[PDB]
């Protein structure tokens, strides 16, 4: 509350770890579905389905330009990718199974980064 605060958790390198981490995810073999915006114009359905796109390229261009303001907000688009492609791909899909696999990679760098 005023004037009485908890203390300070140092967050000078979340900006270059979030960095760090983005690298490894775009490296992931399984990040192919994930690498670039879907096209609106050639998926039939994705515009009206999936009501905030977000993609690793996107994410890079943000975190490049400071729209995060803190690390949550940067995991919550991590992990809007991937409940992205869990609402429009089935499980049993190469592209499903990919986001599975990929949320699983981040969700442990993420832990062992930052937890």
């Given at each position: 509350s005023m004037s009485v605060k908890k203390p300070k958790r140092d967050d000078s390198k979340d900006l270059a770890l979030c960095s760090m981490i983005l690298t490894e995810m775009e490296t992931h073999e399984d990040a192919w579905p994930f690498?670039?915006?879907?096209?609106?114009?050639?998926?039939?359905?994705?515009?009206?389905?999936?009501?905030?796109?977000?993609?690793?390229?996107?994410?890079?261009?943000?975190?490049?330009?400071?729209?995060?303001?803190?690390?949550?907000?940067f995991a919550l688009d991590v992990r809007l990718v991937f409940d992205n492609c869990e609402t429009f791909n089935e499980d049993d899909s190469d592209i499903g199974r990919a986001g599975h696999n990929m949320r699983k990679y981040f969700e442990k760098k993420w832990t062992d980064t930052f937890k």
């Open positions: 690498l670039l915006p879907v096209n609106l114009k050639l998926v039939p359905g994705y515009k009206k389905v999936i009501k905030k796109p977000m993609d690793f390229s996107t994410i890079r261009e943000k975190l490049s330009s400071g729209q995060y303001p803190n690390l949550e907000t």
